[PDB]
Write a protein that binds this ligand. Structure first.
Ligand code: FYQ
Ligand code: CL
Ligand code: CL
Ligand code: CL
Ligand code: MG
Length: 101
């Protein structure tokens, strides 16, 4: 149907921070392909004047997770975290970034 506005591919950790620092709302995020760990994904989220980074972990079957609950896709991981916090220190819910039209 429509492509996801959150997949940025191989953008540096620093480029994710540059982009997200311009976003107004907390929870504004992106999924990127890690450069420090090739083959692994990373989640970058906006919170205040900072950008929090999370590593997308894998189990033995290749399922994705951030903490405990695991999923069959990055798509389901992202969607679950729109209603359950990505952080254990703050209530940060994932919301789509405000794109340059
Ligand atoms: C300053 N340390 C970090 O940024 C590492 C970060 C996880 C992390 C580690 C490496 C990394 O490399 P790259 O950006 O892809 O090149 C990206 C993210 C973390 O610990 N994130 C925190 C959550 C955000 C924060 N409080 O700064 C955490 O507890 N993460 C959990 C859960 C997770 N899945 O990341 C963990 N470390 O297992
Ligand atoms: Cl914005
Ligand atoms: Cl690590
Ligand atoms: Cl929650
Ligand atoms: Mg979806």
């Amino acid at each position: 149907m429509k492509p996801h506005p959150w997949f940025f591919g191989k953008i540096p950790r620093a480029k994710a921070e540059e982009m997200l620092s311009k976003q107004r709302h907390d929870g504004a995020f992106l999924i990127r392909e890690s450069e420090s760990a090739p083959g692994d994904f990373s989640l970058s989220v906006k919170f205040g004047n900072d950008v929090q980074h999370f590593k997308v972990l894998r189990d033995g079957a290749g399922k994705y997770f951030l903490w405990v609950v695991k999923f069959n896709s990055l798509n389901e991981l992202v969607d679950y975290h729109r209603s359950t916090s990505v952080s254990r220190n703050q209530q940060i819910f994932l919301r789509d970034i405000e794109q340059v039209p």
